Amino acid sequence: EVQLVESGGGLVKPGGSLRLSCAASGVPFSDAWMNWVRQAPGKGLEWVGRIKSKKDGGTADYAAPVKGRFSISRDDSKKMLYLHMNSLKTEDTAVYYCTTEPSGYCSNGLCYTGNYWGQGTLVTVSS
Amino acid sequence: WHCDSQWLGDRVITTSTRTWALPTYNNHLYKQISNSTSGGSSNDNAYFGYSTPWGYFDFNRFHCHFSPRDWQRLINNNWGFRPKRLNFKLFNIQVKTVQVFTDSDYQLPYVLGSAHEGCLPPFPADVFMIPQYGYLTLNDGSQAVGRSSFYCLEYFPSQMLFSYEFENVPFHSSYAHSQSLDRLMNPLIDQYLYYLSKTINGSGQNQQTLKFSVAGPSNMAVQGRNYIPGPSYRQQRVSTTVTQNNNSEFAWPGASSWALNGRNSLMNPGPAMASHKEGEDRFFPLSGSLIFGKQGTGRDNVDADKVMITNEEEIKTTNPVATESYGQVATNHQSAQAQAQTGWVQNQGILPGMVWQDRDVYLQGPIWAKIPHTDGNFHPSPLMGGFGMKHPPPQILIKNTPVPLNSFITQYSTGQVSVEIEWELQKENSKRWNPEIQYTSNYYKSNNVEFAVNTEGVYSEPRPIGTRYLTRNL
Amino acid sequence: WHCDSQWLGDRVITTSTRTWALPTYNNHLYKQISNSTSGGSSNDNAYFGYSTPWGYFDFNRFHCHFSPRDWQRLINNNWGFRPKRLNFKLFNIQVKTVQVFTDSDYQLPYVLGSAHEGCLPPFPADVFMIPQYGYLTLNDGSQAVGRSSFYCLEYFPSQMLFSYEFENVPFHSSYAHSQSLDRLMNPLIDQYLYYLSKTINGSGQNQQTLKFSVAGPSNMAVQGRNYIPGPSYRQQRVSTTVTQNNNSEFAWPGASSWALNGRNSLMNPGPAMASHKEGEDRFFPLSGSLIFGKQGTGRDNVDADKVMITNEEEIKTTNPVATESYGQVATNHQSAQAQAQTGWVQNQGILPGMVWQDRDVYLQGPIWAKIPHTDGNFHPSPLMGGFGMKHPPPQILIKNTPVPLNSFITQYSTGQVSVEIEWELQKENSKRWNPEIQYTSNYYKSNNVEFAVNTEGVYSEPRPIGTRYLTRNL
Amino acid sequence: WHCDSQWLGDRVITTSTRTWALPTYNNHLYKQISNSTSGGSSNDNAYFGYSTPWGYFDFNRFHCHFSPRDWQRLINNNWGFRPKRLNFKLFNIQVKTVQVFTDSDYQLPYVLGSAHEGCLPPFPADVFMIPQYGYLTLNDGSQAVGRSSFYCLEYFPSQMLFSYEFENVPFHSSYAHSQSLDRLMNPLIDQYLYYLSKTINGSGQNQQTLKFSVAGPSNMAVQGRNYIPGPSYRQQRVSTTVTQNNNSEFAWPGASSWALNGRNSLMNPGPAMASHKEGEDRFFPLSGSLIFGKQGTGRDNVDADKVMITNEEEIKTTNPVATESYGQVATNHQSAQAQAQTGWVQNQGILPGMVWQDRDVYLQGPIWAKIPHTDGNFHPSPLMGGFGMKHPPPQILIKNTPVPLNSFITQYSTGQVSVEIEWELQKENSKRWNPEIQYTSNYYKSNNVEFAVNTEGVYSEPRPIGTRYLTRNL
Amino acid sequence: QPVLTQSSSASASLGSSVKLTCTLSSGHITYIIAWHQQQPGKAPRYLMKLEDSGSYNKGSGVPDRFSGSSSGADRYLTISNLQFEDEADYYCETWDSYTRVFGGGTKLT
């Protein structure tokens, strides 16, 4: 059973920086691609970025709005996914979900065809 | 000069006589070769070996011994075939002495099972050059190790100027099942075995239940079966229509490989598996199919119409598809807290009760291979097709005897080579009512006749011809 | 009439005579059938084939040849058995001519290995109906392909109104090991081999140390072993207490399957694996058992107590549990910067040095299956149990001759059938001191007698009887 | 007294005589033993069994039958060996009667295949103590089950005070290949097969193409090959430089293991795989390599300089590295949407066309094992090395007859044992020009000669000696 | 970059089937898509993903009344039996190697 919890959400002034973290469970974190998506209150889902697995290279992809402001990091040893936020905007305030990559994740010659959303974390950017 | 084929009962005797030319290689020297002498940087491609002045005769491909009309006559009328005897001759020597010896103890390395060029040409009027002999031994990078070997071929006694008995091997199976592994059942009758049809009554809380049902014609996927399809090692799927393919380079990065002593090697062709699902002919495994070139095709970066890609779709009855997963397995214990979880098997080894078909042989493809000499092996039949043998037809080495000290006279030889193989046949016993599929030429008119010369006199083979046409029951 | 069992030394002869009734099928027509004729749209359930007016005789289940007391006599006193010869007779034809022939070249599809209903009844007084013959061939969806075969059984010579010798097969093993694969050791003595006991001295930085201990009686998990258990392909674990099952429909979604040519077939019953861990009797593998219905059990969605679920737990000595992972492997290289990571091996194929037990045969279950005709197979012993054979007992086809053109006389036939099989036995040599487990009846009073008639004269078999009671060493 | 080795042609005859002492075990009692009696709380370590007053003779290790020179003479000059006959003698009985019987029907549990201590000493002047016979049986926890067996060895007829024919086994291959599995090719010639060199023309959009190239000497990784390396089950990699290992306990947590009936046994030594890559000998698999121990070492938590870790590197030509993945399999279908992906394969079972070498045998290591009696096995050769046998050298059980009822006289016996084995040999036919690698002593001076007593009279064997020196072609 | 279009909101009465359209951009036609439901107060739930062929892989924890099918460049989701328990935003997503795109949501009532 795969479980994904997020943390690091709270109040930050419009100028400033914050880190979010996602600690994966029940999934082979080393072999899987991860994703961040955010949902503005009363609005639909919006994708943020992904982090590819070590085998495929540690490169990360970013959505056009958040490009260059945010970074995604991963700690394979600690099985945690990170989102570093810098230069915030009022519009940024959303519930940030930690989701595994939709295609799937294949570990040790076995593939898994289904997707697991995180619990979600509310981030209110205000002063 | 003997070239012909004698069709007698259950046997075939195919004689072939060719003219050859033997140059002087390496200026009569045994020269060390490695990737350094070539300049190769990469680690996977590192090698160490020696190049020898000797040549060798390679008759190891089918189109050496079979004409297209003999090959059609074989594959349409017969279920199985295999070699019995071998008779080799070398005559009409013309030197412009010549040493020759067979290696009947297999004391040299065996380079014939590697599918190299240099065969006796398919068309008898051709003259062929004799390829150079060389062998690789152990290496670390481009360096050797103490365990590496050096073989002087002058240290073998040779005749200055034979018959062979093939060891017992199974018939190559020329046929394609008229049943599938999963449909072997009687369509009219129910089984007496039950399967679990329903785990819940309906939408709601605490609805768990167990309901069992008879497996029968109505639902055939759940019936119990006595056998399962062959093993799988998945291949990537490439498309001949290039607009499905990804706009990225995945030729080496995306290919299935195996690693030995730190060096990766592409898995080619690999375990025998169907090439594509029924209805999809545009896909082929990345390294899972034998690819032959058309006549006159260049060496480097040819397009997809210059090569002939063979496909195994005949064996899709008993074998998994190369580009698909073998199946699903359960990855967890369910409970009220935990839902059922399954994973898709990418590679599956041998399990008891599997069945499979080996890879097909082609007019252009290899006949035999040598089984490596080892403590163990499983299903030694070679992966490129043909007949695996612990004692295959021996290597035949030949060179010009040097006439003079580095100063020698430029000298070459030529002659005739007649090779004769006795092939055993297995007749088609089928009671099938309706007519078989056959191999046919097409009556529709064309500029040239297939399997014949053009206006410049160049013999060419239009398409790869497989061996499996007639059908059997599974 | 011949029914009895001659028990002679190491041999058994089981004779069974029954009465049959043969109707007229398809009004003397061959008919093309497929899923489109029935109407099931699913792609996994797609089929194509033909139905024939012919019927056939199926004695392939054990309870045809064995009374319950002859079975109890077989399994309690004997370690192994296997069929040797067969004698078949068909007499007392009563038509209210009759064609019959046997297929001794195996030129027809073979439907007798799929565990279909239609056997000679277990109870000698039951008049039974012969099943209809039909077969499936290749298909694409519901359509045929150019490679599909059609067989007219009129085109086989028949006799209008024999003995068969079983090919050599291994003794079926009726016994359960008194040892387990990992406990084969001497409990009193140490090994001379060392294992790695400690990778660190204590809690703190830079504590890396390397310490080796002796494997022995105290710690048995780490000892070296010459053999490892057989292969596994994991099944989902289902509970017979329904409130421990998940509240969702996972019959098909959470099941282990294999895919062939794009059709997913349930993996049933699958490789031989222990049904459940020691002490847990309520869990069975989802698709990984044989499930027999009780007398009168309905066809569709019957409850859990209408059926009989067999358990393989006798083989938990050499075989992995069906619902468990085979083991663990390492997924990385440790270093100062990375901890040791491992993962579960859900499905494992054959490795050298494995040992395993095949699946048990039951009084209800099948006797033999036909090994497919293929280039290769591994451990051909069939997955539902019994004896695998490349030339099994042939199919015996029978029909009524049409007497008149679509206008015919309504007509049927009846008569007697006596099959006689010689069985070879393997005696129990054990030096075990304490008494064996035997298969016995319960003495406590019941309204009915088990394996006997009720007040309506309807014979019933209360439970499946396995073959494994006596013990051997591993 | 007979000790000497007869070297005659193609065979050897080795003879060993030792003096022994036989005590009185369990005060002439049979006693039930389990982990409850032992005190272990773990399930993986749980067991149930019996200890007996009997002893037994174990000659199952090589150094019993071979001096260090006879081993040097064997392994340098021979390509293979295997036992033929055995002649066990027991004489010069001295008591302070004696029962002896051999178990030739294999009706007792067989404990000689578990690599226990208690062998005849390597140095002929030592006097050894006969180990106590005990066995294990089925258990639920520490409790027994109704299927457990009890064996009274008194119920076997014994002689109050023989010769054996080894069943046919393959020659153990005492050689190392001078070629590697991937390098079998002719380095000088192109193949006629093509591979997919490129999938895109250049950087940009919509660049897809299929470009094919010839597999040849320049790129050897992509060539077609008939055979693939043997199976793999990955082990964790430990370094003998302790700072390179991770700072945490991972000996048991990170180890490769298999599970049987819910009990986890370490995978030791496991499949035959090369210990380490070329150039890295500081790494060794966690449970992969047979670890011996130096003389006078100690039982628990010894350092690394107190053990002898054997390496299998000679088989790195045909076998995958134990600490590396087998290879990569394509894990999806590429398309315009998704990039091609591949995944590491940790464990790979048998595929058709695999070849492998078995594990080497050492002067100190075991000779034979007993193949379990089961319905199936694959490549029964044992995993600790040596010769697998269904009916191996019988167990020879010995005890002192009691002289008195629990009151007895304290008493022991002693005497002589001689065992003589005939070994068939396979001579080296190699045509290699340059000299072989040999097993040789080092000239450089030292305080003590190797494989010899010291000033206190303690014999010791300094290093493990493998059997693989001479080379063959692959 | 693909563009996912879908209806703004659609409702159905209990016990009946509702169908929901998700339209792929042109030239992205062949892409595989996945469906998610989000309860009004909860994190989204993966439903299934459907190919251009009409083949679909349903989730592990999902009822059998969900199914999907596709015409050219046009994707569907069919809720055959409507239970008051599922009415929620149904999002349609599609992914590419470079980026992942979501639909605007469809509120079911």
CB B151 within 8 A of CB D431: yes
Residue D296: partners with Cβ closer than 8 Å, 6 or more residues away: D458, D460
Task: Output the six-digit token pair for C206.
Answer: 């830079």
Resolution in A: 3.3
DSSP string, A8-61: --SEE-SS-EEEEEEEEESS-TTT--EEEEEE-TTS-EEEEEEE--STT-S-EE
Pairwise CB contact (< 8 Å): E61 & C253 = no
By DSSP bridging, strand C11-22 and strand C127-129 are parallel
Q: Which amino acid is at C98?
A: V
Chains that contact B by 3+ CB pairs under 8 Å?
A: A, C, D, E
Chains that contact E by 3+ CB pairs under 8 Å?
A: A, B, C, D
Nearest to A61 among E89, E98, E101 (CB): E98
Q: What is the separation of C-alpha B411 from the centre of its chain, rounded to a whole number of angstroms? A: 37
Chains that contact C by 3+ CB pairs under 8 Å?
A: A, B, D, E
Pairwise CB contact (< 8 Å): E97 & B341 = no
Nearest to D261 among C180, C200, C350 (CB): C180
- Mapped to the 3 state alphabet, what secondary structure does D355-382 carry? EECCCCCCCCCECEEECCCCCEEECCCC
Tell me which of 2.60.120.20, 1.10.10.60, 2.170.30.10, 2.60.40.1120 is the CATH number of domain B4-175+361-472. Answer: 2.170.30.10
- Segment (H or E) for B56: strand B48-56
- Quote the DSSP letter at residue B265: E
CA separation for the pair B87, B337 (Å, rounded)? 73
Q: Which amino acid is at B135?
A: Y
Task: Output the six-digit token pair for C404.
Answer: 């008149």
CB C256 within 8 A of CB B329: yes
For residue B269, cis peptide bond before it (omega within 30 degrees of 0): yes
Pairwise CB contact (< 8 Å): D156 & C279 = no
Among D62, D101, D86, which residue's Cα sits nearest to residue D167? D86
Rounded to 5 degrees, what are φ and ψ at C200? Answer: -145, 150
Q: Å from E97 to nearest chain D CA?
A: 6
Q: Which CATH number is E25's domain given?
A: 2.60.40.10
Pairwise CB contact (< 8 Å): C249 & E64 = yes
Could you please state the CATH topology (level 3) that the domain comprising D4-173+361-466 is classified under: Empty Capsid Viral Protein 2 (2.170.30)
Q: Report the greatest alpha carbon distance in chain C.
A: 98
Best A3, A53, A110, A116 residue to mutate vs chain B (most B CBs within 10 Å): A110
By DSSP bridging, strand B98-103 and strand B395-400 are antiparallel
Among D345, D347, D127, D320, which residue's Cα sits nearest to residue D228? D320
Q: What is the separation of C-alpha B229 from the centre of its chain, rounded to a whole number of angstroms? A: 20
Among B148, B115, B137, B59, which residue's Cα sits nearest to residue B394? B59
Among C466, C230, B231, which residue's Cα sits nearest to residue D376? C230
Where are the CATH 2.170.30.10 domain residues in chain C?
4-173+358-472
Whole-Å CA distances, C87 to C63, C92, C163: 17, 17, 4
Whole-Å CA distances, B1 to B15, B92, B101, B147, D167: 10, 10, 22, 46, 53
Pairwise CB contact (< 8 Å): D135 & C186 = yes
Whole-Å CA distances, D155 to C177, D104, D111, D158: 21, 14, 19, 9
Nearest to A44 among E45, E91, E98 (CB): E91
Q: Å from C249 to nearest chain E CA?
A: 7
Residue D282: partners with Cβ closer than 8 Å, 6 or more residues away: D239, D240, D241, D244
CB B287 within 8 A of CB B255: yes
Pairwise CB contact (< 8 Å): C343 & A30 = no
Pairwise CB contact (< 8 Å): C248 & E61 = yes
Residue B258: partners with Cβ closer than 8 Å, 6 or more residues away: B264, B265, B267, D228, D229, D320, D326, D327
CA separation for the pair B110, B75 (Å, rounded)? 30
- Segment (H or E) for E59: none
CA separation for the pair B14, B4 (Å, rounded)? 6
Give, in degrees to the nearest 5, the angle at Cα D384 between D381 and D388: 25
Pairwise CB contact (< 8 Å): E60 & C249 = no
Rounded to 5 degrees, what are φ and ψ at D141? Answer: 60, -135
Whole-Å CA distances, B384 to B272, B361, D452: 9, 8, 54
Among A7, A17, A12, A4, which residue's Cα sits nearest to residue A70? A17
- Mapped to the 3 state alphabet, what secondary structure does chain D carry? CCCEEEEECCEEEEEEEEEEEECCCHHHCCEEEEHHHHCCCCCCCCCEEEEEEEEECECCEHHHHCCHHHHHHHHHHEEEEEEEEEEEEEEEEEECCEEEEEECCCCCCCCCCCCECCECCCCCCCEEECCEEEEECCCECCECCCCCCCCCHHHCCCEECCEEECCCCCCEECCEECCCHHHCCCCCCCECEEEEEEEECCCCCCCEEEEEEECECCECCCCCCCCEECCECCCCEEECCHHHCCCCCCCCCCCCEEEECCEEEECCCCCCCECCCCCCCCEEECCCCCEEECCCCCCCCECHHHEEECCCHHHCCCCCECCCCCEEEECCCCCCCCCCCEEEECCECCCCCEEECCCCCCCCCECEEECCCCCEEECCCCCCCCEEECCCCCEEEEEECCCCCCCCCCCCEEEEEEEEEEEEEEECCCCCCCCCCCCCCCCCCCCCCCCCCCCCCCCCCCCCCCCCCCEECC
Q: What is the separation of C-alpha C387 from the centre of its chain, rounded to a whole number of angstroms? A: 9
Q: Å from B138 to nearest chain A CA?
A: 30
Tell me the torsion sign for CA atoms C280, B342, B210, C63: negative
Task: Output the six-digit token pair for D290.
Answer: 């047979």
Give, in degrees to the nearest 5, the angle at Cα C222 between C218 and C226: 115
CA separation for the pair C157, C161 (Å, rounded)? 13
Q: Is C85 exposed, middle or buried (0-12, 13-18, 19+ CB in 10 A)?
A: middle
Does C427 contact D at CB distance below 8 Å?
no
Whole-Å CA distances, D135 to B378, B415, C180, D54, D152: 35, 74, 12, 11, 11
CA separation for the pair B21, B1 (Å, rounded)? 17
For residue C269, cis peptide bond before it (omega within 30 degrees of 0): yes
- Quote the DSSP letter at residue C435: P
Q: Which residues of A touch B337 (CB under 8 A)?
A: 1
CA separation for the pair C228, C446 (Å, rounded)? 46
Residues, chain D, total? 474
CB B339 within 8 A of CB A104: no
- Name the domain count of chain E: 1
Pairwise CB contact (< 8 Å): D338 & A31 = no
CB C174 within 8 A of CB C78: yes
Whole-Å CA distances, D272 to B260, D269, D276, D319, D342: 14, 8, 12, 7, 26
- Segment (H or E) for C62: helix C62-65
Chains that contact A by 3+ CB pairs under 8 Å?
A: B, C, D, E
CB B320 within 8 A of CB C260: yes
CA separation for the pair B285, B283 (Å, rounded)? 7
CA separation for the pair D74, D84 (Å, rounded)? 16
Beta partners for residue D159, in sequence order: D100
CATH number of C4-173+358-472: 2.170.30.10
Best A111, A112, A113, A116 residue to mutate vs chain B (most B CBs within 10 Å): A111
Look at residue C155 and give its three-state secondary structure.
helix
- Quote the DSSP letter at residue C171: P
Rounded to 5 degrees, what are φ and ψ at A62? Answer: -135, 145
Beta partners for residue B376, in sequence order: D356
Q: Å from E6 to nearest chain B CA?
A: 25
- Segment (H or E) for C456: none
Q: Which amino acid is at E64?
A: D
Task: Characterize D165-176 residue by residue with b for buried, 16 or more Cβ atoms within 10 angstroms of its Cβ, and e for exposed.
Answer: ebeebeebbbbb
Look at residue C36 and give its three-state secondary structure.
helix
Does E72 contact C at CB distance below 8 Å?
no
Beta partners for residue C143, in sequence order: C140
* Count of beta carbons in the 10 Å neighbourhood of residue B97: 11
Where are the CATH 2.170.30.10 domain residues in chain B?
4-175+361-472
- Segment (H or E) for B77: helix B68-77
CA separation for the pair C69, D254 (Å, rounded)? 53
CA separation for the pair B19, B90 (Å, rounded)? 10
CA separation for the pair D280, D264 (Å, rounded)? 31
Pairwise CB contact (< 8 Å): C331 & A108 = yes
- Mapped to the 3 state alphabet, what secondary structure does B89-156 carry? EEEEEEECCEEEEEECCCCCCCCHHHCECCECCCCCCCEEECCEEEEEECCECCECCCCCCCCCHHHC
Task: Output the six-digit token pair for B332.
Answer: 């967890």
Whole-Å CA distances, D164 to A11, D59, D102, D367: 85, 14, 11, 15
Report the chain E residue with the minimal C-alpha distance to residue D206.
Answer: E27
Nearest to D356 among B265, B293, B375 (CB): B375
CA separation for the pair C180, D138 (Å, rounded)? 7
Q: Which residues of C touch A53 (CB under 8 A)?
A: none
Does D354 contact C at CB distance below 8 Å?
no
Q: Report the greatest alpha carbon distance in chain D.
A: 98
Half-sphere exposure of B306 (CA within 13 A, CB side): 17
Q: Å from A78 to nearest chain D CA?
A: 14
CB D237 within 8 A of CB C338: no
Among C256, C55, C116, which residue's Cα sits nearest to residue B215? C116
Nearest to C271 among B189, B225, B351 (CB): B351
Interface of A with D in 18-37 (CB under 8 A): 31
